[PDB]
Symmetry: D2
Subunit: 213 residues, 4 copies
């Protein structure tokens, strides 16, 4: 009833990388039951971004994940009230990004309030030199911890001219009401930038996700 | 030719946890092309083990993983010469286990020389209090780094009376000859202790693994 | 010439902890050559703060450090233009705080623009439980990398009722102009909340710092 | 009574780095009350060592630390029975070394049983490249947890041609009998290889340590 087959997305991200502020706004559409979403993002402050756009994309909602009937869906349960999440993104060269998303619902439209803060990316690293190609597909591991839901994922950015650049995601998901806590399960992800302009001031972003156990 | 549908396993692990030495020997059988193996393990030194047996089980060979024709198989390529691996296992409460395996082939039998060293497990933690139930199934992420193969996995031990206890695996695999390096891929794992005696001096251990991309 | 024996401080911090937004303003005075400073801090938004105030205090300027003749002073060199820093603060229970400070100089007064973002603090951890007493005195180790100055410190919070809580600091300092780079050295720190009200709405904060080789 | 102004040291280390096995023996002498020691170390197996010798030196006894009257001496208290320690050494490029030392006393001579295991050192990192010069002087922070003594230290290796390489030490000290526990304190360390041959087959190693509050 609350979750519709076709829903809208509106977001604003405010943040900084290595002390340099930026802001991005986005509008999109998603199919919660099919685990598919797409959005168009516009850099409003800090452009052209002096860092790899890819570090931001997984911050731009696990309601857009196909959950089978036999797995408890923490996220679709949380609405209309919604949920928030916190995440640390620990890169292998010491770059660390912290992010949050507060997700509310206005009719058939999700509203995101996002904060993003990254520090200690080396000037000669693949992030500050914009040498990333894409995130590889992933499998997130989800488990309950002290009444809330945790999700951890080993992530990897493919690099221009070969190799990978690793990042460890640790997410905590917090429902704004009492919902059923799921057993240990997995979510397969695949995030892709389908189109962008020269300096990534405009980006079309897609994600597909499916839960399994 | 070198890899047979039915192969044998013989291993010896020497190690220590929190400064207390132990040794385990095992014999087993595996189906390399089906990604299935099973073994019987006997504690030879340090028994009865004062720590959770589960911390050891993933140390007791990625040749026992079903690789599809479209994914380069680093491990089956490495034989008859074989390969070695190194691993750090970083637990959330500061317990750290380092492990190595040197894998050789004698006819149709793999021979493992294993070293295992764990430190800083709290006395009141789930490892030293033997409060673990099993490892959850997992998805390992494999990627090439500087001419060798890396494999990282987010692991979780289910606990007696609820909850999970997290560990981060970082493995480096090193072929003893020049082999083809694979593209980014995944291996699904499920390791299970099928039977054991009261103090885990005798353990029957099973693993199923399948690669995908 | 621009560095005076007696100088003023004005600051604003905007931040969030576990997605809870807050803002703090500060006014103070410091003696750059004696490595002593003090300030009055006022919570302006997000009060009363639902976390241990001590996580913020080391974010509220290494210009206030007594540097001997034999060590190059990276920070006093940087003015009037000034410098900025970025820091990751990695707590032993997985809580991570990222912070930045952009420091400018207007007359005899330093102006700070501060951002603070902490995520994944466990509900039952000493930060969210407000169970910290003080930071123990510390020794920061400073070393050059990639033409900028790094500062790392092993930090510990004393806990109410006994025990300690560990945090590892990794700071990158960045002068806004080309300055002479120092060799490996140490800075001894002692930070103390001298007075506060019940909810820490008002805090008097003191720091003493001295460099040595 | 059992602690004399002049005491002897005999040790054996068995270990591996990146799966390469080695063994080292040592004989030395130390002055427990002055916090000074020196020893001659001889590679017995696995020579010539294919890694930076400096990773081993802090593993080759806090009984050799000058303790003032106002601080409880955990280590001198523990004898004649003695104590053991465990340590994780986490390097910034992902190399991790675990080590243990079991220290006993026979007459005026300390006997060490040492285990050392390092994994995941990158082929192009300063350890496998043998590009380290020395450990910088350090300050260890010691604090009680769970009835045992913890010691943590932010460590840095000076690199040949310039720059530094960071490692975080986490040590747990365990007395074999019930002893008085100290409050939070510091131990200043200075470790130096005074002489060695080309392949480090023979090494003369010195350490000076002093506690302070």
């Amino acid at each position: 009833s609350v979750i519709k087959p076709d829903m809208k997305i509106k977001l604003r991200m405010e943040g900084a990388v290595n002390g340099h502020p930026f802001a991005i706004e986005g509008v999109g559409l998603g199919k919660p039951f099919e685990g598919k979403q797409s959005m168009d993002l516009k850099v409003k402050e800090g452009g052209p971004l002096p860092f790899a756009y890819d570090i931001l994309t997984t911050v731009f909602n696990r309601v857009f994940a196909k959950y089978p009937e036999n797995i408890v869906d923490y996220f679709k349960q949380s609405f209309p009230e919604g949920y928030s999440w916190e995440r640390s993104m620990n890169y292998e060269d010491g770059g660390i990004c912290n992010a949050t998303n507060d997700i509310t619902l206005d009719g058939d439209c999700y509203i995101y309030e996002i904060r993003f803060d990254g520090v200690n990316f080396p000037a000669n690293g693949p992030v500050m030199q914009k040498r990333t190609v894409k995130w590889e597909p992933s499998t997130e591991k989800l488990y309950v911890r002290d009444g809330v839901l945790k999700g951890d994922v080993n992530m990897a950015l493919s690099l221009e001219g070969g190799g990978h650049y690793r990042c460890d995601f640790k997410t905590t998901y917090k429902a704004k009401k009492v919902v059923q806590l799921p057993d240990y399960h997995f979510v397969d992800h695949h995030i892709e930038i389908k189109s962008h302009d020269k300096d990534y001031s405009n980006v079309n972003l897609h994600e597909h996700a499916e839960a399994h156990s």
